[PDB]
């Protein structure tokens, strides 16, 4: 059904709350140097294997998302989420989730 902006924001707050838990738990069971769980205001990026592309299904709670696609981040061999080259922002590809990209 036609989700409203207020409903969408509510689901984001609920998803953001789930991301806080997944972070606290991992930060209570630490192991190795993987990329840490991270909330980017859209979805919760999970533990990333270092040196690899991390793929996350386009979240089901975003109404205007293609839920058959994936969003992507890059986790380097140091366990840090890779920045965009030449910029100071974390690299993420959402082109599969959305029509205007």
């Amino acid at each position: 059904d036609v989700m409203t902006k207020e409903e969408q924001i509510f689901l984001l707050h609920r998803a953001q709350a789930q991301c806080e838990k997944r972070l606290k738990e991992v930060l209570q069971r630490p192991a190795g140097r993987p990329c840490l769980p991270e909330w980017d205001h859209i979805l919760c990026w999970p533990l990333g294997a270092p040196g690899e592309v991390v793929a996350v299904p386009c979240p089901d709670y975003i109404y205007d998302f293609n839920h058959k696609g994936h969003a992507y981040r890059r986790c380097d061999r140091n366990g840090s989420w890779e920045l965009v080259p030449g910029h100071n922002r974390t690299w993420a590809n959402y082109s599969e989730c959305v029509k205007f990209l």
């Binding site: 036609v2 924001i9 205001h41 205007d64 965009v84 910029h87 959402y94 082109s95 205007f100």
Partner: peptide, 21 residues
Amino acid sequence: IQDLRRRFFLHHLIAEXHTAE
């Protein structure tokens, strides 16, 4: 489309949070 307020809100999240330019 649907709610343009919802759509245009997602425009902002995608604009700052899709960073591959």
